[PDB]
Design a protein around this ligand. Structure first.
Ligand SMILES: Nc1ncnc2c1ncn2[C@@H]1O[C@H](COP(=O)(O)OP(=O)(O)OP(=O)(O)O)[C@@H](O)[C@H]1O
Ligand SMILES: Nc1ncnc2c1ncn2[C@@H]1O[C@H](COP(=O)(O)OP(=O)(O)O)[C@@H](O)[C@H]1O
Lengths: 51, 481, 502, 72, 125, 245
């Protein structure tokens, strides 16, 4: 029973750390997605203005 | 306004270039009708709006209608005014396009009063500095996420939850409780959904079809079939119809917008067509100004107040995208609509914890209201955390304070329901209006141990806690019998 | 490039009529091609770059691009009623605003024109909008406090007079409660406050101005207000007129304060203006000159040396972040420009810790030079104990060494958190701040109740203000925590504890 | 096949025909719809029509937007 | 590519025999067009290709066809730039191929040569 | 930058003196060049920089050399925008520098001052023929344990330290000791911390890290290593911590 309690506590901590990591990774993903879109359209517009 | 006649010089999609006499050309944001010609054998005119002066007697416009079948050299009529829409009680219970034309096929509307859609906001002196609480009569919205008079509110509920029933209840309640009217503005309205909404508004008594002008709403529809010029300016048309009801009639107006994201989307489309360089994630460079010039006319003057309830779409489900990020610089409150609560029958399906509001502060709502709303939030949050433990242990293997918490939370969660005046037509229950005072007096009693010896199905689908005690006595008579 | 704007037919006809002659159009320019925040003007042969021009509608302009045949002016408003072909007139004056001592109590629309409704403002016209910043020999090291009235700021992030302290956070996380708190705390001091609202909704500007008028702070405050429905040029230019107005008082030996609400909104207006002028944008579509935009504005907040009258200007710029993104472009620009930041945090704001200063990531590069002797002596122990709490609450859910840590965290940290939180628009004087930090971080407020800490502290505050006038005298006389004030405060808090136990 | 019409414009077609194909499909189905019948139309890869329209819009020197797609 | 395709067209049509047409990187047939396209005065498309990518690819890919008088089985190698399968040049070939055989780098990095991705490489037969 | 370089170059050439050239933010040189080059009528590079960015950097950095007359030891701050080390301006500065020092926002926010990232900060003088073999071997082992720590950081982020092996947890503990001992109090930051700055010589640093990596100092707190120098002071601080309790 004490081993199962220790595993319950370890898995609660692991779920919470994975929750915070999911939040951080979603933040960095949205940043990279907006940066990708910005770069793509700025490159297209730069080519179209050079043309 | 006179014989200021232009001639089309360019037709590139829905963007036109018009040439004019050397001294007389319209200002920016000025309507001009294109006296065009249909191929079928009849004339048909096209309305455009000046966006830019180009130099030698030449402007550049954006068509509100389609530009197919237009030749170069058609006569363009300058009008000297912005887009002028009909305003007043003549625009009630009827459907309008971006130009103020009726499209509900009921007949013509009398242009006895026409206001321009391009107008400056109220002055800093004419603004009202008071923090009033708009009362919707709905228990969850009034208690946990209060509304502001003169502020904006974001609907975040997906498709299928009780959204349309909610805005119809808000219309009926602002008509019956206060002396207010409502103005629905459909930015990018799907046509079949527009027809369904108009039919349900006729049926729910909001649009009195047996007698128009007794109605409680004016519909403006900028549809997806329409060019990006119309879909962008339909919000301004709706805001002008609402601003007349504020200014002249001194009512408390309710301005419903559909997805304000499609307002931004049509703006980015017209900027891409006019050729301006895109902003950060590809939006128009005039994003914040295009949004603010709309949102700043939704205020509360000394006369009345426009309160807007704008549905908000978040692209890619992030709140840091420029259209959600610039919309949220104007939102005063927020109601999220729950798929789970709509499933388990807790209509109205507003999520109590995920709905926020900046009105919920002691200075604004009273220390009593603030403390009881915070206690309800704590109770529901504790129950949400404890559902897994009750699934494992059960209510018996809990503690006593936790058990009374769980029971009070089930009662509160069922008390956040309400039978609606407009949802009555298929549910049957007579529908209730619950002011904020009865809401907080009922939640005080359901939270302190004064009403704990009651069934959970006694608070469900009632208003006004006296009705909860009465239905409880009836549910106990069901047992005695 | 084969086409120009001056190649309209009337200009070429007037060139063909008489080729060689003497007199050009000196101050008479005719507008052509009114665009999007720009208008091109044929004429104005002797106009200056930076010169104000005036249109027939009444709109002001600024000559920016002086090409060979036409000058391109930037519209200082909605250029809606600019008839094409109408005349433009130069003024001979580089861009200025009238400055005076009579701006105190008025509300401005970035053009030194009142939107207040209380008539015009008499002035003596001076003070170019783009004034040069002080040099290296002109200024002096910061040495005196600007008391903000917040316990957390004044105790751990001390702000001095002449220091650029940034307020960076998310939306609805403070920064305006903080800015208005600092402005309202300037009642007794001789500080000329300036509030610039760059992109706020006009209702929030109304709330701020009515709060100022209600609490009495408009006798030394000017408000330069640009609402969200304004042209991007006016939102761009409002903080420069705010800085010029404050510099008028700064160079006359008076200490000033200026708060640029939403400098990220000014950068957004500059982005809109550059993109409409087709300039090549960098990262996040910003013009690349956005660092210069912010740096030439913030570099004016100085602390002038004794030869220049010992004036000062403190700048509290406010920057919003997207979901707490300190590593974005404009936040890192303002962080690289200013002298320290104050991080507000959405988790602590929404969780109830209401002045939500993220103390472990906020600095002030003046520090002890800003703080007085009393606050230094008292708040050293405060920042130490709060430092310990900062790792305890994060890493240890309950504790390691659970007995001493309960004597550590429960006694010090979780009660200092309730000690630091402070209501909206309620500043504290420096005596109450020293007293409140002393009663907490020495060890005296280690056995209270977690909801009774606030009531105990407010009642002890009024008690010491009512029954101990000599403590306030001996702290307002030397600004140093002597042993006499210490001992009398100890016996006074014992008196107040035995009073409040009942 | 007795109740079906197939509108096929393969990928060797000019961009104008791949842009026009869903509209001829909709016009035929609209004839049958307005004569009191029930229809069903399947647009296989509407994105291919979007790409054809993007190609012709870029070749007509029109201002591009996101992913070089035109504003309309 | 059009030259070799013409040589295969003759063997399919006039000689009426089963031709086997091996093509090396047809990514290069699109890349050469994207190289010259800017100098041809054309405005650039998505991520950097010519605006006529799909039509240029489609003409060549549609000339390759078994014609009921002779057949051409064509095995084509498609360089996927930066291992990005959602790049436009391979994305416009996926529509023209019958049995696509996507090669993984995660299998080559182990030695599972032939590193044919089993769950990505599908087929219509 | 050019006029400061000219003043230094005169001392290098004619006076034949060994010059120092402390430049603060050579990035702003690039940034102002981009700002004028936009208005100069030039098509911009990748991220809106000037097309003449590499040459504008090289025409300045190639004049900062050590000729037979003198030597210009230049220490330059290079700002990275939005913490983007792959940006064109620092990415072109990296080719001209011969001893880099990359600072970390994470190490700065963890109070580890100076915030020097130990694994990205390289040099061309860490060669056994230039710094001896003992210094080279200790720097190699320090970087190896820090690299192992950075490797298993994500596993110990989701799971925790409780799931590592014995040698891996010993590596973790020694890497935390190392990254604490790498911090130091500065003389110029005596206003930020107090506890005045310590000048730590070279041999003392080598001996301190030899003692950390050797296994002697495995039975003392990590906080004894934080903000100290000359590991005798870490031993004294561990003694003080276990005495004051
Ligand atoms: N210290 C405080 N105590 C009590 N209430 C506060 C405090 N600070 C802020 N608030 C409340 O929180 C709300 C938002 O605060 P504030 O006005 O400071 O942020 P903001 O500048 O409006 O944010 P943004 O403008 O970026 O959305 C305000 O309505 C205010 O009443
Ligand atoms: N208060 C209520 N009482 C009973 N049923 C409701 C209530 N609110 C919504 N519903 C039901 O839930 C469904 C919600 O659909 P609706 O909100 O109209 O979809 P949409 O949000 O797409 O317009 C409706 O069909 C309605 O019958």
């Amino acid at each position: 029973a004490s081993e199962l309690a220790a595993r319950m506590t370890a898995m609660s901590n692991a779920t919470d750390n994975a929750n915070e990591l999911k939040k951080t990774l979603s933040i960095n993903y949205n940043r990279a997605r907006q940066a990708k879109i910005t770069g793509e359209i700025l490159e297209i517009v730069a080519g179209a203005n050079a043309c | 306004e006179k014989k200021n006649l232009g001639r089309i010089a360019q037709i590139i999609g829905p963007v036109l270039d018009v040439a004019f006499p050397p001294g007389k050309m319209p200002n920016i944001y000025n309507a001009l009708i294109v006296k065009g010609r249909d191929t079928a054998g009849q004339p048909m005119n096209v309305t455009c709006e000046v966006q830019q002066l180009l130099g030698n007697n030449r402007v550049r416009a954006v068509a509100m209608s389609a530009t197919d079948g237009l030749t170069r050299g058609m006569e363009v009529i300058d009008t000297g005014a912005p887009l002028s829409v009909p305003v007043g009680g003549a625009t009630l219970g009827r459907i309008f396009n971006v130009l103020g034309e009726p499209v509900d096929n009921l007949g013509p509307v009398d242009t006895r009063t026409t206001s321009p859609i391009h107008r400056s906001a109220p002055a800093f002196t004419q603004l009202d500095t008071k923090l009033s609480i708009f009362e919707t009569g709905i228990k969850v919205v009034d208690l946990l996420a209060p509304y502001r008079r003169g502020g904006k509110i974001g609907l975040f509920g997906g498709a299928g939850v009780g959204k349309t029933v909610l805005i119809m209840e808000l219309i009926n309640n602002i008509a019956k409780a206060h002396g207010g009217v409502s103005v629905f503005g459909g930015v990018g309205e799907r046509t079949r959904e527009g027809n369904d909404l108009y039919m349900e508004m006729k049926e729910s008594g909001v649009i009195n079809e047996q007698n128009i002008a007794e109605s409680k709403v004016a519909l403006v529809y900028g549809q997806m079939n329409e060019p990006p010029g119309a879909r962008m300016r339909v919000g301004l048309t709706a805001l002008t119809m609402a601003e007349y009801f504020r200014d002249v009639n001194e009512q408390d107006v309710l301005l419903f917008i559909d997805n304000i994201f499609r307002f931004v989307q049509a703006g980015s489309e017209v900027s891409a067509l006019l050729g301006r360089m895109p902003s950060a994630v590809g939006y128009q460079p005039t994003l914040s100004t295009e949004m603010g010039s709309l949102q700043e006319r939704i205020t509360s003057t000394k006369e009345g107040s426009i309160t807007s309830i704008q549905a908000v779409y978040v692209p890619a489900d992030d709140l840091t995208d420029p259209a959600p990020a610039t919309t949220f610089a104007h939102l005063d409150a927020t109601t999220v609509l729950s798929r789970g609560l709509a499933a388990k029958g807790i209509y109205p399906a507003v999520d109590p914890l995920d709905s926020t509001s900046t009105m919920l502060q002691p200075r604004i709502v009273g220390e009593e209201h603030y403390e009881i709303a915070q206690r309800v939030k704590e109770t529901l949050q504790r129950y949400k955390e404890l559902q897994d433990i009750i699934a494992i242990l059960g209510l018996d293997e809990l503690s006593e304070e936790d058990r009374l918490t769980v029971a009070r939370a089930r009662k509160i969660e069922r008390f956040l329901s309400q039978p609606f005046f407009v949802a009555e037509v298929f549910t049957g229950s007579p529908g209730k209006y619950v002011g904020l005072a009865e809401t907080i007096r009922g939640f005080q009693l359901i939270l302190s141990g004064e009403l704990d010896s009651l069934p959970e199905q006694a608070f469900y689908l009632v208003g006004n806690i006296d009705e909860a005690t009465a239905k409880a006595m009836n549910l106990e008579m069901e047992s005695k019998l | 490039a084969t086409i120009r704007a001056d190649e309209i037919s009337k200009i070429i006809r007037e060139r063909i009529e008489g080729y060689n002659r003497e007199v050009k159009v000196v101050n008479t320019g005719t507008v052509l091609q009114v665009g999007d925040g720009i208008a091109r003007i044929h004429g104005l042969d002797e106009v200056m770059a930076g010169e104000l021009v005036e249109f027939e509608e009444g709109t002001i302009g600024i000559a920016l691009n002086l090409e060979s045949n036409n000058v391109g002016v930037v519209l200082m408003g909605d250029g809606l009623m600019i008839q094409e072909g109408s005349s433009v007139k130069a003024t001979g004056r580089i861009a200025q605003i009238p400055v005076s001592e009579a701006y105190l109590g008025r509300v401005i629309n970035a053009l030194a024109k009142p939107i207040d409704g209380r008539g015009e403002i008499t002035a003596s016209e001076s003070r170019l909008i783009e004034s040069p910043a002080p040099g290296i020999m002109s200024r002096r090291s910061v040495y005196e406090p600007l008391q903000t009235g917040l316990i957390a700021i004044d105790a751990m992030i001390p702000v001095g007079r002449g220091q650029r302290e940034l307020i960076i956070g998310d939306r609805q996380t403070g920064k305006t409660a903080v800015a208005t708190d600092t402005i309202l705390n300037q009642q007794g001091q001789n500080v000329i406050c300036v509030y610039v609202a760059i992109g706020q909704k006009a209702s929030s500007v109304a709330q701020v101005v009515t709060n100022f008028q209600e609490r009495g702070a408009m006798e030394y405050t000017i408000v330069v207000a640009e609402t969200a429905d304004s042209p991007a040029t006016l939102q761009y230019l409002a903080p420069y007129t705010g800085a010029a107005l404050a510099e008028y008082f700064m160079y006359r030996e008076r200490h000033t304060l200026i708060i640029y609400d939403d400098l990220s909104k000014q950068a957004q207006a500059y982005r809109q203006m550059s993109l409409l002028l087709r300039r090549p944008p960098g990262r996040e579509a910003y013009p690349g000159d956005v660092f210069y935009l912010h740096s030439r504005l913030l570099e004016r907040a100085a602390k002038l040396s004794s030869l220049l009258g010992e004036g000062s200007m403190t700048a509290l710029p406010i920057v919003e972040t997207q979901a707490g993104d300190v590593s974005a472009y404009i936040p890192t620009n303002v962080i690289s420009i200013t002298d320290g930041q104050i991080f507000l945090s959405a988790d602590l704001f929404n969780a109830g810790i209401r002045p939500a200063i993220n103390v472990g990531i906020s600095v002030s590069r003046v520090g002890s030079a800003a703080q007085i002797k009393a606050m230094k002596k008292v708040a050293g122990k405060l920042k130490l104990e709060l430092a310990q709490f900062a790792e305890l609450e994060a890493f240890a859910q309950f504790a390691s060494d659970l007995d001493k840590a309960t004597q550590n965290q429960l006694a010090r940290g979780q009660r200092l958190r309730e000690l630091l939180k402070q209501p909206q628009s309620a500043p504290l004087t420096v005596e109450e701040q020293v007293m409140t930090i002393y009663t907490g971080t020495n060890g005296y407020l280690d056995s209270l109740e977690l909801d009774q800490v606030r009531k105990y502290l407010v009642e002890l505050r009024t008690y010491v203000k009512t029954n101990k006038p000599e403590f306030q005298e001996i702290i307002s006389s030397t600004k140093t925590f002597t042993e006499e004030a210490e001992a009398l405060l100890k016996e006074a808090i014992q008196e107040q504890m035995e009073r409040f136990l009942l």
